[PDB]
Each structure stands twice: as structure tokens, then as C-alpha cells.
Structure 1
Amino acid sequence: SKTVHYLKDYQTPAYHILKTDLHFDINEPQTVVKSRLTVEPQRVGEPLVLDGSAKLLSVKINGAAADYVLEGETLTIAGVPSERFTVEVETEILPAENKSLMGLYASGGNLFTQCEPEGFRKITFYIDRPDVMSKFTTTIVADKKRYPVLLSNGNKIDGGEFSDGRHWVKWEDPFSKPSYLFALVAGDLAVTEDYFTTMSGRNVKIEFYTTEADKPKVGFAVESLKNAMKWDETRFGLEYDLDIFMVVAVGDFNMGAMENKGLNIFNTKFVLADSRTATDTDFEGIESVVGHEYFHNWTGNRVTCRDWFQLSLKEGLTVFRDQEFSGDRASRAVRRIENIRLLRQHQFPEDAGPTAHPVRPASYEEMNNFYTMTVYEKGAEVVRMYHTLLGEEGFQKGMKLYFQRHDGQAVTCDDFRAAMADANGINLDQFALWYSQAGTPVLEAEGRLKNNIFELTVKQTVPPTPDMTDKQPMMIPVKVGLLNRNGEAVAFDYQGKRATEAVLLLTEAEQTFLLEGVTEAVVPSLLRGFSAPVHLNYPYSDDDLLLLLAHDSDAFTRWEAAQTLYRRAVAANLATLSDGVELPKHEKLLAAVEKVISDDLLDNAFKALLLGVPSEAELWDGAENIDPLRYHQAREALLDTLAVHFLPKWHELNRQAAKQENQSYEYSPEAAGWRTLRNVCRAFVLRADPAHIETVAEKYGEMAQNMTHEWGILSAVNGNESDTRNRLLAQFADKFSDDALVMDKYFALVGSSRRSDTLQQVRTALQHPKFSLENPNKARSLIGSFSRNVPHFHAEDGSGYRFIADKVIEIDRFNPQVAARLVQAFNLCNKLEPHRKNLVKQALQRIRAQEGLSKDVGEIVGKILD
């Protein structure tokens, strides 16, 4: 009797809602919501079924008290007119009691909403599904001194005052929308005003709302929005469609931001920065996410989702758009590698684990569990493959046809694919499998130069996943090139064209590609630009990898050669540590890294990436009976070797980076590149010479010229067993006690430390006056960081597992979304060595045994355990 939602069961709704008129009467403590729905029968005579979980005060049909039944979270009216009719629902909400941060809730003494995916039903009774689109008008009444700012979607068309100190506003959004895009804000908030003029000459008023204290940190977000608006015009030909665009910052928020039409609501983390309190990465994040939410105005809002299985239709596409925006801003190659690295570090384990799902899932119990790395980041890689197959011009032809066909509609992934296919006159039927088949495809490649042909044989395979065993061959673009003995590009003939690069389109289980007219011995460069989201196996020698790393023209393949050398070095460490003998010499790797360190032609941020070692999760990919501490030990040994071996050169590279930064402490991509390299150097220095922390501490103020430097130094020393580490962290918390986003950084350092005493420091931090478990940013920073802290989470005595399971249980009582994300710390369960596996299963069984456990957490626990 447990409810599962299946894509195969989709049916159009029995009723449409043409008009949604809302009235909010905000009081202390309760808010009363009145709705009036103009309902249009589609299947005449069916019962009207409304979703809702708010306290119900009354229901009318055509103005008279309705005969209805309330059952669970539904309201059913059996006796429906056969003609257009209205329904009026009155509900009552206590927003200060709402710690789920879905629906209408309080934060910092103000009121905010979050409705995606199914939060609107926590406000009123509604047909709360995204293929039902309605024109909203929203009236808000509140005390003026307490709630001077009253916002909802669209245009402000009326307002006024009452003699008792109350005031009101009325907002009309002329664009039909699904309920998940509804927003309301009521509060005492400061505003920052700006504008943008569209290419048709229309001014758009821009308003950012923040606390009074936070206002000085919102400027970069405003600038980023104007950049995003211009970019969507120049790159996609897309113009904004209202004369007002509002953004509201909120400190209590389950995700990063939300694209509500004309009234975006952002986590403070993705809108507030200055150089004193935010890192360069934080600035890049604001640019990315402000872009993302604005880009949803077309890819999400103007064209929306038929059903929640199609989430990647808007999210994969909009992530692709924010990636392209950021790459067009600056540093495209480095940013592309950053994106690839995040996918392989976080999404690949998802696809290999118990919660693996297709980009377009076929079923779900709780839709909030499917806002995933797969739907978003793999979703974006799928959209990018259209770009790779079609080119920018062809891709834009597809976009044009997509909007022509589907503006104002709620559609499917299939419709996006068809627009791409039809606009370009190409068959993309096989491409559909990128949406329906889960798992990381594995390509096995072999190469031979015989006659004057380089014959590249490639096989593909996709593993069964828990949802599906049968996996058919997919359409996989493999971008390639060839290097001669001196690492020079070598031209070849393919499909009657002589070039140095080609896209090989693998569509069968096994294919041979003939690169003809090759006049010299070659080493192939494969999967350039990470041209498909796959695992590629090709037999490279260490010397082949050094060649690629030294001379290849593609950023990804150069970086992947280094990643491979690191991976092989860790594997060699695993072996020696296991045999109880001396560590390997790693002579070739050390020679390779020396070259990278000493190369002054390398981009600084690219050099920093070449000096990064794959994470433990990457290293144990594909393994069984995993002891995570053995992998941690082997990785730490490699980092120690790199730190100590090159210690003088790490200091020298640091000095060179400092000189080039040139005291330009504000955010810019140029200065940030130097600081990124500097922070890599700091990490290695303080590994090799932990005593250097006292030298750092002595001159801390001189060093602390922005938060990128403070964060970089505190990160570097965070695992140091000196008392000074603890003192510097305490001083950081004191300095920045009043800045909640910097206190998030403090708590992340507490939870992530490799020091031996981290569990007890974490437990003390739970009682820190600036910590709140009910704040998702804080919970994520402290507890989330601890759950990803390999030696502590995976402690042999099980203390890490017991602690995280305790917190899943505690958090689930008020915020199931946060708890269900946290409990995925346990996803490695069935791949662990027996002792830890036993303890993880005990932890999961204890979570399962909780009375009233959320559907959110229960769905995840079932996938891991059952």
C-alpha cells in the first residue's frame, strides 16, 4: 500500500485551473489564505481532487458550502458542475512552526515560500502538478511596520493602507504557470535597485531584497544578473518578458535558489559576497547560480515540465546554460574540467550505487529525492552531447524550434530531443537511451597502426542498475586526436576529411574506426573535452601518459593523464602498505609533477588542477570489500610524498603566485587563478612542515587580505595536530561571529578535520551559539562535512556511523529533505568490508525502526538495505 509514482501511468488532468486568485491575511501567529479557483472541466463528471495539507477552515463551490471529504492530504468534491465553476478554499497556516522550509515559513522574522516541487499544497488545496497552469493574482494584507515589504509574482497592480496600521498589495502575474513557481515574501527587508535595458529597448527594474546588514554584500549578484540577461540575448536570442525582476535572499533554505517567475528566492550563500568574507569560489558560485535562475525564465518557466519525471528537461538544460554562461565569462577550459571533476567525484558514485536512476526516472516515491547529481549534472552532459553532435548553430536551431513549438506548454524530455532532431534533419532515436538508461557506460578501446591506418576498436557496455538489467548500445560521441613521438598533433583522414581532430560516433556494441593516411607512429588522444559521460579504458603506458600530460592540446585529456598517473601511484601504495614494505619510489610521477611545477607557460588555475589528486571515492570506484581507511592511508601517503619531496618548490611557487596576484584582493578571474595555485602550495607546505603554522600565525593579519587567503590557510592547517590550529579556528569564529556565511565555513572546518579528535570537536560545535541544526546551511556545513570525512565517518569502531544515524533521525523530525540527503552518506554500504558493512546495516536498520520516519528517508534506506 506504499505509494509509488510511475511515469507509465501518466494521464492528463481531469480538470484545468484557468485562474487562481489568492488572498493572504498575515497575523500573529496565523496566516489565513483564501483561494478562488476558476476550474475548467476536461473530463466532465469526474470528482474534483485537490492536494492539500494545510489546516482547512472552509470549502465552497460556486459560492456555496461544498459537500466534500478530506482524506489524508486530499480533498475530494464528488458533485461537480459540468460547466466552468469556481472553488473557494480557506486554510490556516502557522509559518513560525514550519521548520521543513517548504510551503509558507518564517525565517529571520520574515515570511518566505518554497513551492517546488509540491510545496504549494502546504499553503492551499490545489491541483498541485506542473501540467496544470493558471494565471495567478495575489493579494497580501499585513501589519505595515512589521511587514513593510510584500511581494508576489508579476506586476504590482494595486495596494493601499488601512487605519489600523495594516496595509495591502495586489500582484498580477499575466503568464500562466504551474503552482511550483508561485512565491510570496513578507518582511522588513532592504532593497538594492538597478536596471537592465532589453534588446527591444524595454527597461527592466531589478530589485534585490536582503537584510539591512547584508545589503552591502549584494552588488556582485546584481552585476551577475545583468551579465546573465545580456548573455541570454546574445547567445540564445532570449529576452526577459516583464518590466520587473526581483531577487530575495533568505538564510534558511533547503537548496541553493529557486526560479519563481519574476521573484527568485536565493539561499544567502548564492547571493552575498565581498572579498573580506567570501572566497573566489563563492563569487563564481553566485555568478553561476544567479545565471541559472535567470536562465530558467525560458528553460523552466516559459516552457515547463509535464510531470516531475521530466525534471531534467529544465534542470539539465539550465545547468548546461549556466555552465556555458560561466565559460563565456572567463576561463572556459578550467571551468569545464572543474565540472567534469565534480561529475566523476559525485555523480559517478551515484550511478554505481544503490540509488542509481536514469536522467528521466521511471518511478519515485518522494520527488524531493530526485534533485540529484544525475538529473542535474549528468543531465547537463546529455544536453551538451546535442551540442557536440550538432554544433552551436545546429543546437540553436533546435532551441528555436523547441520554443516555437512549446512556449506556454508543459512538455517532456522527448519533446526537447525531437526539437533538436527535427530542426537539424537528423535521427536521434537512439539518443533517447541517455534519458532512460541509468549507469555509467564503459568503453573498452584498443588501437593499432597498420599500413597507414590507425585502427581504433571501441566496445561499449552499460551495467545493470537496480531499476533495469537490459542496457542496449547507446549513441556515444568520442572526440579524438593523435600525437607523434614528440607530442605534436598528427593529421588523419576520416569521413573523407583530413584533420587533426574528429568526433567518432559509437552507436554499436563494438565498432572499428579507421583513421587513414597516418604517416607516423602515434599515441591517441581520446574522449577530448570529455565528449561523453563515460568511463574509457585504453592501454596507455606510463610514458604514453607523460607524453599526453606534457604535449596534448586538449585540457581534459592532459588532466586525465595526470589523474591516471596519480591513480596508479595510489594503487601502488595500496600494494606496498598491504605487503608491509617500503612505499614505491614513484620516480616517473615525481618527474612528471616536477615538470608541471616548473612550467611557466601553464595557466595558473590549470596547473592547480594538474596538482590535485583524485578523491578516495574515485580511487575505490569499482572495488568490492572496501576498507575506506586503507584508501585514505594510501592517498595520504602520496600527498605526504608530494609535499615533502617538493617542499622548497612549493614555497617558491607560492612566492611566484603572491607576486603575480599583485595585491589585487578583489574578485577577478585573473587574480583568483593565482590564489588557487597559492592555496594548493599552502596545503602541501603545511603537510610537509606542520611547524610552519606558527610562522603563519605570527603574521596572520598580514596574510589575511581576503577570505580566499584565510580559507586557504585555515584549510591547509585544518588537519594539523598543533594547538595553534585550534586557536586560529577560534579566532576566525570570533572575528566573523556576526556573518552567518562565514560561520558556515568555521563549522565546515570543524567537521572536515583529519585530526584525531574531530568527533568530539563536532559534538561541542553542535552547542555553539551560532549553530542551529534547523538551519540547512549549518547542518550541511558541520554534519554533512563530518559525513564525508573519510577517516572519521568510516572509523572502525562505528562511532561515525552511529553519530550520523543519530542526526538523520533527529533532523528527520523537522526536515526530511535534509535528512534524506544526509542518509546517503551510507550509500557505500554493500561495497564495504564486512565489519563496517555490518555496522552500517545496523545504523540503517535503526533509522528504519523509527516511528513516523519520513517517506523521504524511508525511500533511500530501502534502496540501500533491501
Structure 2
Amino acid sequence: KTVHYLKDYQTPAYHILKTDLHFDINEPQTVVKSRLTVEPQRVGEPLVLDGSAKLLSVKINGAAADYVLEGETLTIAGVPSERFTVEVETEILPAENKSLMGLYASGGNLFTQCEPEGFRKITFYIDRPDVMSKFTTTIVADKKRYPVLLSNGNKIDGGEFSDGRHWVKWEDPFSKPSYLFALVAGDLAVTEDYFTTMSGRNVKIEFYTTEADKPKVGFAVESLKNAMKWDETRFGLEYDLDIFMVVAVGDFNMGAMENKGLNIFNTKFVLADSRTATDTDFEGIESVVGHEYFHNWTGNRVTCRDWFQLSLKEGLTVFRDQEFSGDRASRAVRRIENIRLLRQHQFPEDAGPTAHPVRPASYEEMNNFYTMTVYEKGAEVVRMYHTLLGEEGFQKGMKLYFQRHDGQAVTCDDFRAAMADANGINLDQFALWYSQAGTPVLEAEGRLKNNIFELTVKQTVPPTPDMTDKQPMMIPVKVGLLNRNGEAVAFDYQGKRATEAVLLLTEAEQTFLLEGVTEAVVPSLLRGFSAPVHLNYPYSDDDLLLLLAHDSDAFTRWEAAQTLYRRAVAANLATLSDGVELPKHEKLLAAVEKVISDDLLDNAFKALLLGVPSEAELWDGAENIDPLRYHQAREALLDTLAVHFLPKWHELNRQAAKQENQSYEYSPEAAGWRTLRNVCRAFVLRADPAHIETVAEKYGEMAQNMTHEWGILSAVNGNESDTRNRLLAQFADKFSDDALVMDKYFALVGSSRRSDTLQQVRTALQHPKFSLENPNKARSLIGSFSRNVPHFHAEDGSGYRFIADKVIEIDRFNPQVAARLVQAFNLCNKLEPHRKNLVKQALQRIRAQEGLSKDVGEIVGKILD
């Protein structure tokens, strides 16, 4: 079983200077011919090409090569000592490609996905990102069937043939790794716009969609134009071609893809209108359109040496996309959402069997490393450079990075060195953020003696499956102090008098002296979530209420609420387990009443303060978990809050509706009110499930956009009324023609806490609009069921069996989807014995499948072995 190790990296023996491709598209086969111009680096080594397409011929300088093909590699032993050409002819059946990697069909059109190692499914090549070549691509096809023929770069020639066929030739002048190749052939509608760069050069913008989806592309176009302007104003980065194309595709494994000048997007991240897309969907488009555009510099112009460096482009591009969205609107709310995402999804990963460093030391299947750790913790790591260095110094680091490395394939170490060198600071210890897996745990204690607040802080990082030794890391802790009435208190550190400071923890244990303090204080700690850590400080319930009411930092106010909810859930667990009455939660209820009633709180921030941590956050750190017990305790808390404040939930909803003021289109302002409104609806329908018939009666009047339909349907989705079933059926009939709205129906089916979800999910498998072979559908229905705690973790094992059956079925055509699904079982070692036994059986049965993919195999072994 091949494992790839970062320690074994060696530069390539061969470079590829020029890559000329010819695609001859027919029914059913596409024949690909290449001409590669190959430059020896280590003369006399065998030429080894990666590839898995059907091989029809290979030549070296025009003569039939003597070669051997074994597995997915082709080797030619007798190669010239100087420049030579290699010609390879392959044949592909793209309508049989259900993996959606390489060249594949979708909606009668043809698309590619090459990142990370898809290009070798098209031709034989040196398919690694430190090999950068200049591509020119010729495409020939039936004109009526394939009128749009695209590939990267500039379109330099084209023509017609008498038999109905036409051709185009695309030249991309920038050297690139093979993972950034793209090709599209299809009958697609175009939407045209343009942007004029800071140097006065127009860039033609073209979005390609189906003819029916074209009216939903306008928000994405405007978001691209905003991202282009923003890279220029914030980073001083300008686009480098006079054309930028984006192509939407309904069958796609991930969100989008930054192929140079020809980005390919999942429909879900480009199409929206207010009738069919929620405000969250719009925000997603804005983030992801920016994200892919930001890759032009952070990924394309500067690339990755090897796949272990994935976070070099993804952490930094996520950071860029986060900063773009925060500059657009609602910076603090958006930051909290990001933190919440990290703690809900990335913390469990770092605590579990598949935990890995931001820059892994080894992998079996690289597709398994497109993770919350590489992306979201990666962005947190980039952000720490910003926190340490300031915006100006961070920009000096970026400028040096591009001066040094424009045109190169580089490492996380190079980025770190650029940050360090541009600012004249030593960041050697900072490398541990790349190499050390696990969430650091800070233990802190504070004392005000004399007029010094002495904050003592210890750090530790647990062993993870790859590594036991974890040394002290460089951790910035941003702090403030509140007095007895919650106003800010100034303090001295280090020779500066201010109301905030970044305390830099670099050792196992340190004491920080905040001097010149004249009042009794409670510290505010880890402001802005200044490092991706767990922090334990002994706070009283009154201290948490003070922080929530009065602290000036969003994160720490929201963390205080989160802590109160968590403590209440813990209290419920205790009573439920003793068979006694539920706690009163008198202080939490009083804090919540304050939030509800506070009219100076931003609407969307208010909604976050009223969100209860998820079950996985609640069982973080526990052993012998019974997921249903945590679910029960959380549900009891939500029911308490729903019922206790029912009339005030109705009132808040009404104030929010009045303020929304019939502005149903997307804007950050209107969205905030809708978000609050949807929190109220959830609570109302908890407390008074009968209110569903009153909703049903006025449904048309309430259904003024998808944010409202989604919010209502979400609110009632766990209701045992038949009316919940009728509303869902009517939703599926109304939007039957919109694939992205059908994804939403399937998600409601899969996520319901009603007792009869498993059978409704089984029926939905056979819905005319469901397709197991479509990643958006599979994820919506099955993926949602796998995260549906009461159903997935049912005591009878029915959930585990179902999900294991679908890993097995899906893995037969799409290992990437199946390997993402099988991670539903990651909690295995931490479950109570009865459920653990059943999960282990499910995983052994997956492992016993003949021909199980490497992708799913790798994850099952981490869990089981």
C-alpha cells in the first residue's frame, strides 16, 4: 500500500516546457493527443509518466517508443540527453466517468476536474505541481452539439470543417502545473460583463450556464467584480489576462475550482435569486467567487511544490476570502460565524482519529486532505501572522512573497520566511503551527495583587495519531479587563498604557504582568479568537453575565453566552441521568431575557447569541459518549427556552418583520433581520407546534423569498404533524424544476428529528429528482442523515447500517463522496460500548468489500486500526 511522505520529496528528473494538447470529441469517445517538450534535469533517468486513460500510442521524437505500462505509470528507459518530445494518444469515454475527476460528462456537456491528480486521467503526464509548463489546447467537436469550446487562456485561432465540426485553439501564456488545466465543451448560454483593472486594461468576464440557469448568475458576476476591485485595493494585486471565464456545473465533487482563467463552479456557488436562494446562499456565492478569484495570485501565480503544502494556497486563500467578506459587510458577525464553523467541524477532526497537521507529513490518498484542518485552521494560522504583524506588516510579507516566488512552486516554509524576513522578526517557533496537529489547551489563572493583574497561562497540546511530542507553540492571546460595571480598565504592558494588548505565550508556562490597575477586574481573554485554542479560565456565572452584557469584543461576548449554554446542557445531563426534574437555569434565563430585549444589539449578532452549541461541541473531550443523552439534554434546553419565552419570540419576530420592511432581495441589512426572524420561528414552533397550521394557512403570504420558505420549513421540520409532510411535498412540487432547491428538500428530509426519518429517507432515494450519482444530492439527503444525531446514532444500529450500506454503494462510482461520508463514523472510539460495537461492525463490513477504494480504505484504517 503506497504512502507518500513529505520527507521523501525530490525534485523531478524531467521538466515539461511545453504541453500541446489536441482533443477530438466524438460519440461516445474523445481521443486526446499530446506533444510534450521535455527537458532533462537528471540526464539518463527513466521517464516516468502518470496515467490511467486507455493508451493508444506513445512516441518519442516521432517514433514509436519502447515503453512499459504497469499500473498507472508509463516508463521509457531510453531517453535523449537533451530536449525531446513525447507524443501520447489516449482515449476517454467521458459519459462513463461517474467519479467526476478527469474529463466527464454532465447535463450533456463535458467538463474537467484536475485538482489534485485528475489530469493523469486524461493523458500521461508528469502530474505533480512542481512541474509547470506552458499549455496550448486544440479542441475539435460537432458544432451543433458542442458550440462552446473552452480551455485556459487566450483564444488564438479556430475554424470550421464541412462535415459539421468546428475547432478552437487556446493559448495560456503562463506556465502552470497540470492541476490547473481545464476544458469545457458544451451547449451553454453566456453572460458577459467586464472589469477595468487599475492599469486601465479591460478584462472581459464571461459566465457560462445552462440557458435556464442564466437569469440566476447576476449576483455572482457582481461579486466577481467586487473581488477584483478588492484584491487591487487591499492587496495591490491585479489580474493578468484580458479574459476571465466561469462555468457552472451541476455535477461536481466540491465547491469550485480556480483553473487559470477558466474557473469551474458547482451551481450552488454561482446561482441565486431571491425566490430560490437563501441569504446564506448569496453570502456563499460571494465568498466562493472571491475565493477562486483570489487563487489567481495565491495558488496560480505562486503554486505548491507538493501536495503536502496544500495549506500554502488554501489557508491563505480562505483567509483572503474571509477578509473580503468582512470588508464587504458585518465583519464581527462574519468572524464569529467562521469561529463557530471551526469549532464545530475542525475541532472534532483535531480530536479524532483522522487528525493531521496543517501540513501533513504523509498521505495515502491526497483527496482525503481537502479538510477543515488544511482550510479553516490553515486560515487561522495565516490570520495569526496578521495578528502578530499588523495589516501593514502582513502586506510587506505578501509583497516579499510575490517578489521572491512569482512563477514558482513553493512551501509553507517559504511563506513563513517571507513574513519573517519582510518584518525583520524571528518566526522559527511559528513553524510548529504547520507541523503539530491537535488543538492547544491553555490553562489560565489571574490574580490582582497590589495593582498588578498577574495572568498565569500554561499550554499543552495532546498527542495525535501521527505524533506524540508536542512542544510549546507561539500563541497570541489578546486581552482586556472589565471593572465591576463592565467598563474597560486601562493597564500597563509593556511600557504602554492601553485598554487591550496581545500577550504572546511562547513557553510551556508564563506569567504576564498587567500593571497600574486601580480597580477590581475580570479579564476578557482570547479576543477576536486570537489563536485557534481551547482556553480554560475559572469564570463564575456572574462573570460570564458581565462579559455578555458589557464586553466590547464580539467573540468574547458570544463565548460567554456559549459557556452559559454549555453549563446548562451539562446541568441537564446530570438531572436527566439522576431521574430528577430539570434545573431552573435561573441566571441563564435572565441573561437570555436581556439579549432578547436589548435593542442596541445588531440583529445578526443577537441571533448568534441565541444559538446553542451543537451536540459535538457539547461532547467534546468526553469518553463513552451516548449521543442520544447529549441530544436529549440539548433538546430540553431548547424546549425550555422555546416555552419560557414564547410570547417574546413572537414579539421579536414581529419587530424583525417590521424592520425588514418588505425588502426581500438580498442585502446584508435585510438578511440580518431575516436571520433573527428565523431564530424566532424555530423557537415558536418548538413551543407551539400547532402554530404550523396557522403558518400553513398564510404560507403564500409568508413565502416572500427562499430565506423565509427555508426558515419556516426548517422550523417545522421536526414537527410530528402531517402538515409538515404536506408542506415539504408542496415545496418539492413548487420547485421541482430547480435542482438547487431540490437539494434543500432532500436536506430537510435527511435532517428531520421526527421519528420516521429513516423510512422517509429511504423513500427519498427513489424520488424522481434524486440521483445518488450527483454529489449535491447525495450530500443533501445521505450526508444530512449521517449528521442527524438521533437517527444516525439510533441504538438499534439502523443508522450505522444505512450509512455503511451507502458508503459501499457510492464508493463503487465516487470514492471522494464515499470517503467524506464514512467520516460520519469518526466518533467510534469515543462511543459507549453498545454503539461502538455496532460502528466497528459497520466499518469492518466496509473494509471487507472487494475493490474498496484507497480513499475510503485510508479513512477506515485510521478509525479501526
The two structures have a TM-score, normalised by structure 1, of: 1.00
User: How far apart are residue 463 of structure 1 and its match?
Assistant: 0.1
Equivalent residue number for residue 169 of structure 1: 168
Distance 1:430 1:12 in 2: 27
User: How far apart are residue 743 of structure 1 and its match?
Assistant: 0.1
Distance 2:578 2:122 in 1: 62
Equivalent residue number for residue 42 of structure 2: 43
Q: Give a deviation string over 1:463-521, Cα, whole Å, max 9, x none.
A: 00000000000000000000000000000000100000000000000000000000000
User: How far apart are residue 310 of structure 1 and its match?
Assistant: 0.1
User: How far apart are residue 630 of structure 1 and its match?
Assistant: 0.0
User: How far apart are residue 200 of structure 1 and its match?
Assistant: 0.1
User: How far apart are residue 723 of structure 1 and its match?
Assistant: 0.1
Q: Does 1:835 align with 2:834?
A: yes
Equivalent residue number for residue 567 of structure 1: 566
User: How far apart are residue 167 of structure 1 and its match?
Assistant: 0.1
Equivalent residue number for residue 592 of structure 2: 593
Equivalent residue number for residue 304 of structure 1: 303
Distance 1:234 1:452 in 2: 45
SS state at 1:733 partner: helix
SS state at 2:630 partner: helix
Distance 2:541 2:853 in 1: 50
Distance 1:438 1:542 in 2: 32
Distance 1:384 1:862 in 2: 33
SS state at 1:490 partner: coil
User: How far apart are residue 67 of structure 1 and its match?
Assistant: 0.1
User: How far apart are residue 244 of structure 1 and its match?
Assistant: 0.1
SS state at 1:489 partner: coil
SS state at 2:593 partner: helix
SS state at 1:473 partner: coil
SS state at 2:263 partner: strand
SS state at 1:293 partner: helix
Q: Give a deviation string over 1:431-453, Cα, whole Å, max 9, x none.
A: 00000000000000000000000
Distance 1:789 1:493 in 2: 50
SS state at 1:142 partner: strand
Distance 1:313 1:495 in 2: 33
Distance 1:622 1:819 in 2: 27
Distance 2:218 2:806 in 1: 37
SS state at 2:132 partner: coil
User: How far apart are residue 858 of structure 1 and its match?
Assistant: 0.1
Q: Does 1:424 align with 2:423?
A: yes
Equivalent residue number for residue 734 of structure 2: 735
Q: Give a deviation string over 1:634-653, Cα, whole Å, max 9, x none.
A: 00000000000000000000
User: How far apart are residue 551 of structure 1 and its match?
Assistant: 0.0
User: How far apart are residue 740 of structure 1 and its match?
Assistant: 0.1
User: How far apart are residue 406 of structure 1 and its match?
Assistant: 0.1
Distance 2:801 2:55 in 1: 40
User: How far apart are residue 721 of structure 1 and its match?
Assistant: 0.1
Distance 2:163 2:545 in 1: 77
SS state at 2:36 partner: strand
SS state at 2:190 partner: strand
SS state at 1:354 partner: coil
SS state at 1:569 partner: helix
SS state at 2:176 partner: coil
Q: Give a deviation string over 1:376-425, Cα, whole Å, max 9, x none.
A: 00000000000000000000000000000000000000000000000000
User: How far apart are residue 796 of structure 1 and its match?
Assistant: 0.0
Distance 1:778 1:314 in 2: 28
User: How far apart are residue 599 of structure 1 and its match?
Assistant: 0.1
Extract structure 1 runs of 4+ deviating beyond 2 A: none
Q: Does 1:138 align with 2:137?
A: yes
Equivalent residue number for residue 653 of structure 1: 652
User: How far apart are residue 606 of structure 1 and its match?
Assistant: 0.0
User: How far apart are residue 130 of structure 1 and its match?
Assistant: 0.0
Distance 1:775 1:458 in 2: 49
User: How far apart are residue 362 of structure 1 and its match?
Assistant: 0.1
Distance 1:353 1:660 in 2: 44
Distance 1:465 1:589 in 2: 36
User: How far apart are residue 356 of structure 1 and its match?
Assistant: 0.1
User: How far apart are residue 71 of structure 1 and its match?
Assistant: 0.2
Equivalent residue number for residue 63 of structure 1: 62
Distance 1:676 1:444 in 2: 35
Distance 2:495 2:469 in 1: 36
Taking the TM superposition and a 5 Å limit, the aligned residue runs for 1:30-109 are 30-109=29-108
Distance 1:578 1:143 in 2: 69
Distance 1:799 1:736 in 2: 31
SS state at 1:249 partner: strand
User: How far apart are residue 728 of structure 1 and its match?
Assistant: 0.1
Instruction: Tell me how large the CA RMSD over aligned residues is.
Output: 0.1
Equivalent residue number for residue 525 of structure 2: 526
Distance 1:583 1:452 in 2: 43
Distance 2:484 2:594 in 1: 18
SS state at 1:106 partner: strand
User: How far apart are residue 120 of structure 1 and its match?
Assistant: 0.0
Distance 1:826 1:540 in 2: 35
User: How far apart are residue 129 of structure 1 and its match?
Assistant: 0.0
User: How far apart are residue 265 of structure 1 and its match?
Assistant: 0.0
User: How far apart are residue 603 of structure 1 and its match?
Assistant: 0.1
SS state at 1:204 partner: strand
User: How far apart are residue 169 of structure 1 and its match?
Assistant: 0.0
Q: Give a deviation string over 1:111-150, Cα, whole Å, max 9, x none.
A: 0000000000000000000000000000000000000000
SS state at 1:76 partner: strand
Equivalent residue number for residue 470 of structure 2: 471
User: How far apart are residue 795 of structure 1 and its match?
Assistant: 0.1
Distance 1:539 1:639 in 2: 26
User: How far apart are residue 327 of structure 1 and its match?
Assistant: 0.1
Distance 2:638 2:265 in 1: 37
Equivalent residue number for residue 180 of structure 1: 179
Q: Give a deviation string over 1:531-566, Cα, whole Å, max 9, x none.
A: 000000000000000000000000000000000000
Structure 2, gaps ≥5 residues long: none
User: How far apart are residue 175 of structure 1 and its match?
Assistant: 0.1
User: How far apart are residue 718 of structure 1 and its match?
Assistant: 0.1
User: How far apart are residue 766 of structure 1 and its match?
Assistant: 0.1
Identity across matched positions, percent: 100
Distance 1:600 1:855 in 2: 55
User: How far apart are residue 707 of structure 1 and its match?
Assistant: 0.1
Distance 2:238 2:250 in 1: 30
SS state at 1:745 partner: helix
Distance 2:451 2:844 in 1: 62
Q: Give a deviation string over 1:245-298, Cα, whole Å, max 9, x none.
A: 000000000000000000000000000000000000000000000000000000
User: How far apart are residue 847 of structure 1 and its match?
Assistant: 0.1
Distance 2:170 2:792 in 1: 49
Q: Give a deviation string over 1:226-250, Cα, whole Å, max 9, x none.
A: 0000000000000000000000000
Instruction: Number of aligned residue pairs: give it.
Output: 865
Distance 2:548 2:601 in 1: 11
Distance 1:636 1:65 in 2: 70
Distance 2:806 2:76 in 1: 41
SS state at 1:568 partner: helix
Distance 2:842 2:861 in 1: 13
Distance 1:774 1:463 in 2: 39
Q: Give a deviation string over 1:33-88, Cα, whole Å, max 9, x none.
A: 00000000000000000000000000000000000000000000000000100000
User: How far apart are residue 657 of structure 1 and its match?
Assistant: 0.1
Distance 1:294 1:203 in 2: 16
Distance 2:291 2:578 in 1: 50
SS state at 1:194 partner: strand
User: How far apart are residue 218 of structure 1 and its match?
Assistant: 0.1
User: How far apart are residue 629 of structure 1 and its match?
Assistant: 0.0
Q: Give a deviation string over 1:310-333, Cα, whole Å, max 9, x none.
A: 000000000000000000000000
Distance 2:859 2:82 in 1: 44
User: How far apart are residue 610 of structure 1 and its match?
Assistant: 0.1
SS state at 2:643 partner: helix
SS state at 2:144 partner: coil
User: How far apart are residue 569 of structure 1 and its match?
Assistant: 0.1
Equivalent residue number for residue 369 of structure 1: 368
Distance 2:628 2:34 in 1: 57
User: How far apart are residue 302 of structure 1 and its match?
Assistant: 0.0
Distance 1:613 1:475 in 2: 31
Distance 1:661 1:405 in 2: 50
The two structures have a TM-score, normalised by structure 2, of: 1.00
User: How far apart are residue 808 of structure 1 and its match?
Assistant: 0.1
